[PDB]
Amino acid sequence: ARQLLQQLVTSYPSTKMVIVSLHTFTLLAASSLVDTPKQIQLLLQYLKNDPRKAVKRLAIQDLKLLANKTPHTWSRENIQALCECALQTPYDSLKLGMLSVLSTLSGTIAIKHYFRSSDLVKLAQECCYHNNRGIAAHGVRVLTNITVSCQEKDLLALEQDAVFGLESLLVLCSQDDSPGAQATLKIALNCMVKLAKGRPHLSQSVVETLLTQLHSAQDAARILMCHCLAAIAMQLPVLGDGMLGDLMELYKVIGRSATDKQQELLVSLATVIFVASQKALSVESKAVIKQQLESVSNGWTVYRIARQAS
Amino acid sequence: AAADVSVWEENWEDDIVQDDFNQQLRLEMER
Amino acid sequence: DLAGMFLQIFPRPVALALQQALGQELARVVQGITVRVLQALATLLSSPALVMSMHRSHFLACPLLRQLCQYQRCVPQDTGFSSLFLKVLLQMLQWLDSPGVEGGPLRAQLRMLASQASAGRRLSDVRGGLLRLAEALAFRQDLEVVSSTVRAVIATLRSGEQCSVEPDLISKVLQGLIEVRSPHLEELLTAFFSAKPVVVVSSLLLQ
């Protein structure tokens, strides 16, 4: 079947025919998992050489499928070829696709098999400062995965590159309040949570970035960063004391004008208040009760905040 | 071509699953 | 002031405040200080350095350049901001092209920004540009120049009308681009055949 599919791709090089044939070859390689290395090599060859954007897009989708299925079978040469392709392509959609494949790979053991300043790190650093938000999210995800998975001390210089890329991505995604921006914001905040777990000495800077960005972000973004702060403070409660002032101030200013979307913001803020409080509450408790009783006729908000308190 | 990931993996606010008890409680006490 | 702001950032929370201010300005503009900070940066680049400090601290410089480019993209009709942005990008490229600095994310980001800026402009002569491409592809050197010229030709074909045919010239250029394996072949063919194409394609396939 492999020989027949090779004969088909060489002898029927139409866009439809080559797409169906390459997808079928990829699925056959995934099912048989013996030709999978040379299938990856073939897909990278088509990605690099074939100029058709559709063929490249299929190659990206198939490599993402193989990365999800058999990341361990990827060699160093395969990842090097993919990184080179991502580096020297001019089109942003294709670059975003290859970085999606590479971010899938970096979350697996393929990163350990890949290992200095290599093409992967150079690409990830270049991509995390891209104008495109999706490319930036994928690049900073690759950087975060490298930082938390590889404790090798030759690449601790990108530890702060990862932190600052996450912070810049926060600044980029906070004001938009658009679904694509919300998706990139979720990616960035998940990466920050992962980075706080993996490298606890960076937790203070991550928390400070989140707190400073809380005062200048939209409501949906505020809810997402409240979830991020709740995660970080649940795992590392020592940072709770440092975030109480900013969170309480934002709780005061939100509750004065809390109309429709601020109910979710109110429960998120109360959740981080309760999580970040190692001890009980005396004045913060009074502030929360006052903010509830003053305006909130929404019983559901009160119930969810009481659930978090208990 | 996208994927979904959650910022906080024990966040009780996610509406991924809606149960009857909380449904009637919400519909009964939300204003 | 802003010059002192720059001399305090690169050689840290104040840079965070600057980033927040730039984001606020971007949100305000897209809903309805950037020029001041850009002019301060340009005047500082005029005097003697700061680029090497931005190279060693690219995690500060690159978000700022990203914010400024997004400002430029939001309001491209505000001429004077875009020209000065291109000027400072070229100034940094001149100041960073020395071999001793080695690699760096900052250089790649600036080169990408310059290429993006140079792609949004037309080119006058289709025949002249195509002949330029023909001999440039004959030497097969200056691949960045080749890519920029092909992008200009694509923009020209997007906006302009069809110039002289010259099937031999167009076939030679297509064959050369196939040999060099440029990534812009598909876009070039789309732009070319949007405007004889069958004879050209058949002759290319036969060879």
Taking the C-alpha atoms of residue A190 and residue A145, their distance in angstroms, rounded to an integer, is 11
Tell me the C-alpha to C-alpha distance, in Å, between residue A195 and each of A138, A182, A220, A235.
15, 20, 22, 12
Helix A119-127 vs helix A92-106: crossing angle, to nearest 10 = 120
Q: How many CA atoms lie within 13 A of C33 on its CB side?
A: 17
Residue A181 and residue A157: Cα distance in Å, rounded? 28
Alpha carbons A175 and A129: distance in angstroms, whole number:
18
A294 interfaces chain C, CB cutoff of 8 Å: no
Structure token pair of residue C207: 């060879």
Q: How far apart are the first and last CA of chain C?
A: 66
Is the distance from CB of A88 to CB of A126 less than 8 angstroms? no
**Measured between CB atoms, does A300 come within 8 Å of chain B?**
yes
Chain B residues interacting with chain A (CB cutoff of 8 angstroms): 1-2, 4-13, 25-26, 29-31
Distance CA C149, CA C168 (A): 20
CA distance A243 to C64: 27
The answer, yes or no, to whether B and A have at least 3 beta-carbon pairs within 8 Å is yes
Sign of the Cα torsion B2, B8, B10, B16 reads: negative
What technique determined this structure?
A: cryo-EM
What are the C-alpha distances in Å from A204 to residues A224, A229, B2, C96, C135?
Answer: 18, 11, 31, 34, 58
> How far apart, in whole angstroms, are the C-alpha atoms of residue A297 and residue A307?
17
Taking Cα atoms as reference points, which of A167, A156, A157, A158 lies closest to residue A189?
A167
| 3-class state of residue C75 by DSSP | coil
Rg, chain C, Cα only: 21
Element (H, E) at C163: none
Give the relative orientation of helices A157-174 and A119-127 as an angle to the nearest 10 degrees: 30
Q: A79, A114 in Cβ contact below 8 A?
A: yes
Residue A177 backbone class (left: φ over 0; alpha: ψ -120 to 50; beta: rest): left
**CB of A284 within 8 A of CB of A273?**
yes
Report DSSP state, residue B18: -
How far apart (Å, rounded) are the C-alpha atoms in residues C104 and A148? 22
- Which chains form contacts with chain A, at 3 or more CB pairs under 8 Å? B, C
Across the A:C interface, residue pairs with CB atoms under 8 Å apart total 76
Using the Cβ of A117 and the Cβ atoms of chain C, whether some distance falls under 8 Å is answered with: yes
Residue C95, token pair as written in the block: 């100041």
In single-letter form, the type of residue at position C206 comes to L
Q: Name residues whose C-beta falls within 8 Å of residue A182's C-beta, 6 or more positions apart in sequence.
A: A173, A176, A220, A221, A224
The alpha carbon dihedral of A101, A103, A105, A107 has a sign of negative
- Number of other residues whose CB lies within 10 A of the CB of residue A40: 25
Question: Is A52 within 8 Å of C181 (Cβ atoms)?
Answer: no
CA distance A217 to C20: 10
Q: Which of A52, A90, A175 sits opposite C184 (nearest CB)?
A: A90
* Residue A3 C-alpha, separation from nearest chain B C-alpha, in angstroms: 31
Cα separation values, A175 from A11, A178, A217, A255, C183, Å: 52, 9, 6, 20, 35
Q: How many CA atoms does the CB half-sphere of A150 hold within 13 Å?
A: 26
B8–A264: do the CB atoms touch at under 8 Å? no
Identify whether the C-beta of residue C195 lies closer than 8 Å to the C-beta of residue C157.
yes
Gaps in chain C with C–N over 2.5 Å, residue before each = 11, 32, 48, 195
Q: Chain A closest CA to B15's CA: distance in Å?
A: 12
Please name the amino acid found at residue C89. Answer: L
SS3 for chain A is CHHHHHHHHHHCCCHHHHHHHHHHHHHHHHHHCCCHHHHHHHHHHHHHHCCCHHHHHHHHHHHHHHHHHCHHHCCHHHHHHHHHHHHCCCCHHHHHHHHHHHHHHHCCCHHHHHCCCCHHHHHHHHHCCCCCHHHHHHHHHHHHHHHHHCCCHHHCHHHHHHHHHHHHHHHHHHCCCCHHHHHHHHHHHHHHHHHHHHCHHHHHHHHHHHHHHHCCCCHHHHHHHHHHHHHHHHHCHHHHHHHHHHHHHHHHHHHCCCCCCHHHHHHHHHHHHHHHCCCCCCHHHHHHHHHHHHHCCCHHHHHHHHHHHC
SS3 C48: coil
Judge contact between A140 and A191, C-beta under 8 A.
yes
Residues of chain C found within 8 Å of residue A88, distances taken between Cβ atoms: 183
Nearest to C65 by CA among C105, C7, C120, C97: C105
Q: Nearest 5°: CA angle at C64, between A96 and A133?
A: 20
CB A191 within 8 A of CB A210: no
Residues 6+ apart with CB under 8 A from A29: A2, A35, A36, A39, A66
Between CA A81 and CA A159 the distance in angstroms is 25
- Measure the CA–CA gap between C115 and C135, rounded to whole angstroms: 22
Q: What angle separates helix C13-31 from helix A157-174, to the nearest 10 degrees?
A: 30
Which member of A61, A190, A307 has the closest CB to residue B12? A307
What residue has token string 């050197």?
Answer: C141
Final resolution, Å: 3.1
C70, C26 contact by CB (below 8 A): yes
CB atoms within 10 A of CB A310: 6
Backbone angles phi, psi at B10, to 5 degrees: -125, 45
Contact A254/A266 with Cβ under 8 angstroms? yes
CB A60 within 8 A of CB A98: yes
Q: Do A186 and B6 touch (CB under 8 A)?
A: yes
Q: Are the C-beta atoms of residues A81 and A62 closer than 8 Å to each other?
A: no
Question: For chain B, how big is the Rg over CA atoms in Å?
Answer: 13
Give the integer Cα–Cα distance in Å for C88 and C45. Answer: 8
State both tokens at C183: 């990534």
> What type of residue sits at position A279?
K
Q: Is A160 on the interface with C (CB under 8 A)?
A: yes
Nearest to A291 by CA among A269, A260, A261, A307: A269
Considering only CA atoms, which of A243, A155, A158 is closest in space to residue A203? A243
Radius of gyration of chain A from its Cα atoms, rounded to whole angstroms = 23
Residue type, A198: G
Sorted by sequence, the CB contacts under 8 Å of residue C30 that are 6+ apart come out as C74
Query: Which residues in chain C have Cβ-Cβ distances shorter than 8 Å to A91?
Result: 183
Angle (CA) A190-A194-A198 rounded to 5° is 170
Please give the C-alpha separations between residue A57 and each of A96, A101, A109, A132, in angstroms, as whole numbers: 10, 11, 25, 18
